[PDB]
Design a protein around this ligand. Sequence first.
Ligand SMILES: CC1=C(CCOP(=O)(O)OP(=O)(O)O)S/C(=C(/O)CO)N1Cc1cnc(C)nc1N
Ligand SMILES: CC1=C(CCOP(=O)(O)OP(=O)(O)O)S/C(=C(/O)CO)N1Cc1cnc(C)nc1N
Ligand SMILES: [Mg+2]
Ligand SMILES: [Mg+2]
Ligand code: NA
Lengths: 802, 802
Amino acid sequence: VIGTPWQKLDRPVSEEAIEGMDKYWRVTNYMSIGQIYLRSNPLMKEPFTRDDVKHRLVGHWGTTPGLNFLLAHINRLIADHQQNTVFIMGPGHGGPAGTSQSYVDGTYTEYYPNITKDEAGLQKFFRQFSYPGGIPSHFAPETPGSIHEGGELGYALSHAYGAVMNNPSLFVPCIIGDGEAETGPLATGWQSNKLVNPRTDGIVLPILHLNGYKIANPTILARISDEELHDFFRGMGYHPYEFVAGFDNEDHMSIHRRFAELFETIFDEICDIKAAAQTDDMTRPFYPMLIFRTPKGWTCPKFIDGKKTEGSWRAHQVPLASARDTEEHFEVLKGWMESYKPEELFNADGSIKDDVTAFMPKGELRIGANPNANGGVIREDLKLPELDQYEVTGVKEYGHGWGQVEAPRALGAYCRDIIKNNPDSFRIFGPDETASNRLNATYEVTDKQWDNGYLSGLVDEHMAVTGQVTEQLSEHQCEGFLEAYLLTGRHGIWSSYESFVHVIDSMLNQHAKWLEATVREIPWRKPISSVNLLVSSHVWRQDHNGFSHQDPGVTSLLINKTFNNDHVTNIYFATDANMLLAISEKCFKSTNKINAIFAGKQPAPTWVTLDEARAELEAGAAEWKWASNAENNDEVQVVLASAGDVPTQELMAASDALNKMGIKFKVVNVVDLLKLQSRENNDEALTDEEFTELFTADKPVLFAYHSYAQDVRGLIYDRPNHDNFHVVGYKEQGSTTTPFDMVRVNDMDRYALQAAALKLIDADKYADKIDELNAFRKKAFQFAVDNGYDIPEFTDWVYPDV
Amino acid sequence: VIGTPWQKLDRPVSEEAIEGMDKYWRVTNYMSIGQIYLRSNPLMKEPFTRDDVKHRLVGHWGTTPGLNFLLAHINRLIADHQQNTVFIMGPGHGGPAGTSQSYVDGTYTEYYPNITKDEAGLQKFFRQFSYPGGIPSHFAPETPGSIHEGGELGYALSHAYGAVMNNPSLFVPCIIGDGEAETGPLATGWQSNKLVNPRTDGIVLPILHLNGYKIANPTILARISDEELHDFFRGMGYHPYEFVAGFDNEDHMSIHRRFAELFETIFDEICDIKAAAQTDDMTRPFYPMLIFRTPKGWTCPKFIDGKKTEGSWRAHQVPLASARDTEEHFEVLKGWMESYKPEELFNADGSIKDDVTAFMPKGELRIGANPNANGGVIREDLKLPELDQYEVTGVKEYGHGWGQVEAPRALGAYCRDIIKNNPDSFRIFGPDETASNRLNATYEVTDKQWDNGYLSGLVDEHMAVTGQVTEQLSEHQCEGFLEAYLLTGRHGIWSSYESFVHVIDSMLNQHAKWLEATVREIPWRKPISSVNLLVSSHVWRQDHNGFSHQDPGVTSLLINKTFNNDHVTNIYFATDANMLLAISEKCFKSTNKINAIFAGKQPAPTWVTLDEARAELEAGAAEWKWASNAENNDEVQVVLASAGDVPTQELMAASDALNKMGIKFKVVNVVDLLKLQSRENNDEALTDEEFTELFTADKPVLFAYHSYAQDVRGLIYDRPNHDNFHVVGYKEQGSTTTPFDMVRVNDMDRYALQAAALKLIDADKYADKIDELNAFRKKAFQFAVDNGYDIPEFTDWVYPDV
Ligand SMILES: CC1=C(CCOP(=O)(O)OP(=O)(O)O)S/C(=C(/O)CO)N1Cc1cnc(C)nc1N
Ligand SMILES: CC1=C(CCOP(=O)(O)OP(=O)(O)O)S/C(=C(/O)CO)N1Cc1cnc(C)nc1N
Ligand SMILES: [Mg+2]
Ligand SMILES: [Mg+2]
Ligand code: NA
């Protein structure tokens, strides 16, 4: 248990804590300006000149002093209440407020021994901010206290809420940019309080950083009427409190006393909600939120060159951009840095005075030290059930190609038993698609958690105010909740209709970059569990839905996060349920990855046994010798290669026909896509030798690909024999139609695959047979048109091993 | 002018209109069930059997009767008021309500002469819905009345609002799924009423289709308290009205009279807002919205196999999935279809009776016929100013490589004069980035439109309650507003930080699919203006921001919409401002495209004259003979090829150094990327012959690529000499650093490019020179670390032609 969760003070905030908060605010403002502007002389020791200013002024002042003010008050709260706390910096461009916090709390020096607590250290701390060889401009992963960089705005609230799931002792003040609040993802993020339980989950306090402005405009929320703003937050299930400061001549000490008093009232109400929820965990409370209205750039010069800067968008980036070049700007910077009275804040040795920090939390309650902000320190391996009990054994008993299994249902049963063994640290998320994607065996042991109104057992099924499945019709919510749940040291999976994975392409980009930085250069930030995404309801079988639901191209996006041997991204094609099982076990054991797990949910043949799935998954690509008919590679007329359940079924039916014509070929299944790359691009890929062994030194290869052929083509560009590959993939053809017609219009159906194989072997010789295959596809299509269902020769075909 | 906009009735709705609306509702429900279930016998003529039911039951009943009810009432409104109206079907899976509407209004038969108004036609109309060879399951582009398919949920409101921009006579009832409202994009879409002006823009009426449920869950909005729901919409600046029907035994005629009366009150209030706005166009009104609360699946059987179906998520897709297979389900379907009393709705010849449609609007006010729902019928070419006056003439006067121009500023001046010549049909959108992306010369002739509070001329600049620039910190809003503005026949452009384009990857996917279907098979849907996206503030120069802002991979997503010779997607690299000018003119003249226009906004050399830009843009790739030093292709030791402003600057400096060593090469610039593909994949690409002429038959090619090398590699896989290309691209390396260091860590800097060229020519011979180049890059980096700015030999280099 960290600290004493949810305890009220029952006394006023002390005047000593007020004094310490004002010193914190002044010292973090001063060091924030130092980080932005100063390359040397951090204490402005005589002579202090333009030669001490950075030649390249980069960074963001505007948000920063509002952040620094909140952080003083959140630190004071943590210390007084002994409250387990992780904050979110929505405006992650306020990085210097986040580095200043960690430097004040002591964690910065603990993690970075060279950045010492004295003038030499402070010199280095100032120069290194957004500087070549130094540190980022944003609240990056290498800052102690960060689980959220906030470079790409919008995910503040899904991360805050994901962090408090099954974390009942954790408090998350979530600081949200008022420009950020104009984004889609943030606007829906407010509604998460219908999806958390105040007894089993912790508490988010949204704090709207209402500084009036974004980069070059006012914000929507700052300029509507106060009554609309209050009705808005109340209508989303919050109790709104509003603080306004810095627009008049109120002295700063009074501002701190009024805020501290307000913040105690807010926390008291959180504590009341927490206490009440031990008895009534079904009534959804109105959680507090804070509207925090202060001038953008608060405490910077009011006008600069006749332009309003404090209380404007002009404060957004770097004020006084000429501080190095004109004595006029330099003098303004000098008076601005002096207004914080650094001589009262630093000892002569340049260490921050003890009376600046006596109010601060200590040990693991410090924002930089809390283990929830470094969740791999808390994470434990899942207790996984034995995989064997889930095996589709039909393949062993009856033959390769057996049955009509819906593959994710084996993952559902596996996930069911993972939740049972790990009842509060493995969650499933779905955008209203968990049942549609066939993971609903999980409801045998838990419920979809819903903390909003109930009506009737006739309609409410498998749903309770607490549980380990979460659904909201929002890929942004599913992906954001899950990320923070992993970042605080837990585990899970989500599923999405494949075409709609793209809604969160840019969230995958950011989480992969978080992973890239971490595995490269932040060894103190320990391994988190992986993002596991079941990509299902795929392009080939969108029977009720059509063309808008046909886009497997998240493969292509993921290929753009496969560099430097980071090994943070995996694309798995689950061939059948036994392969799905093997892949998922690997994924649930992995750390520091995004794993995209492709699997079809339609009824489909099972191809391999579980033991075969385990061996093949490890190699990444494998020959299926029981399906090959060639003696050896020199006898092979064409390589039949596939990746994806549906390309594989069609390749396999093609292989059966090609066998019956006396054609000689081998069958290669591809499961771990990126292992097709060269060792030069991926040091864990198949070696040239193993690649040649699978794909031959120079026979034609027909490659039936689940997604866009472009991917395989770019991946194999330097592989031996790549010029012989013919990649067939999805090509933006399709609609609401029969399963055969969907493969047909992409040349993916088994007849077109047989034709293509013939064309690669000898086009002249097989001219007629090709025409005949092409005409059979026309006839099978006419038949679908006339009769309403696919021709029985297509639908009734089982692989001859069965 | 269409109809008589914004006129009140000043009498009750007639009883004859009530009777016609109830008949419409019954006939569209009946034909919706027919489309889903029936392959023959649409009027259930004896014998009506299971043999008349589809073998594959696909589609969505649940939303459909609520849509059909609203559509009856919106048609009645249009007719009574003569009101120019386009609706949005948020739940676009309610396609049969949208096809039924067009069939009732007569447009379906007008566009599809074979689907006739009689029993034979109705037979065909039923079978063809989501059927092989037939029509989609959703409100697809081939349905008259659709500007919005609604397969991928979330964009209902940005499309509604974009449609009414500069469209002051247009009314848009926007029907929004209550599951849809859980998405990010929809949640922010509500706020658009702060960005439209009630005098110069038309009016959206959001109608929340609060049917209680999504696929397998209740919805957030349906289960919060009524007081929270009302405060929510009021707090977003609406006046909420709520209708509740179908939960009790109220007869349907009473339901229609109560709704019609409510809808007249709502419209009267819209008319009052429109009239008031002719005098006071600065006060933002509280626009009505409608909470429409009715049971999901309304009028279907209440229980099926003991399961509550009407008023449940179970009504979502296909009830009675066994209607063909068991007589039990068939009997239920038969009684359900009979409950609408089709014998009162159809004449014996199976034509819909005249008294079903006498209340309907006629001619161009019909929902299917309105030209705003087919905007290419209204669209006119832009009056473009002459390009020459924008030319950066520095290249002609001083030499290739001249100057420090910020390229988008020439596009800003061009856009400025486009707005001036086309003052109400060309808009610019930006996510708070129009000024940052250097398009702010447009503010010389118009303002950012902001219909929300003002504070002071000290802070509010270039902003007014009306204007042709729109900003909101939401890529979803920018992309949605623009799409509908083009779909209703107008023009514009938006700009985004390149890494954040990915937020709307999936919107680009849908709009490209809309375009694919249209250019392939909907000739009646005329060409719209193109989506023009300035992709700027790119990966190489994110000086204030760092790694989270470095992701040029929208290139890769776009490559997945380049099939079948559709020609709906273009990726342009603007080399400099003269190239930018040429590309933009092409884009502003194009139709039916998405054009991604890459351009840097940092100061940069101008390479080509405007006349050269025009020729080179047309070919797609071009030799720069003034920069090549080889005689001819056989004398070439390496091809220096680049795409992007920064790769080009670095290639060019490399070329200067390689020249001074006596190396022989040619320089090829690439502007139109997809013209690198083979003619087999793209019938407008460079032919093999022209490709070979540029890239040689067999010399090494060094290709410096703006984005991920993967793209070029997959694109050129079947081109002559592709095995000789070495593609250098972005490789997930970078942070907040100097411009040289950013190119350095991706091996993109000029020294690494010179090294790479040497390595391709003769690695052994140039071993030493390579090492020396590699060490110079280390020294230039140390210098940045030590001094705060890049080494003057890097920054001060100008191409020797200057
Ligand atoms: C538009 C924008 C910013 C203004 C934020 O305004 P705010 O009100 O949220 O914060 P403050 O006023 O507290 O500064 S900071 C920023 C940068 O590129 C930095 O990441 N960008 C570009 C941006 C656009 N879109 C997205 C999704 N994320 C972004 N970071
Ligand atoms: C989740 C979902 C639907 C429920 C919609 O519920 P609603 O309340 O908005 O509409 P009704 O109750 O009026 O039916 S219909 C649907 C399909 O795949 C169809 O496009 N999907 C999957 C889906 C997920 N995510 C996105 C962005 N779009 C989607 N269409
Ligand atoms: Mg702000
Ligand atoms: Mg609904
Ligand atoms: Na090759």
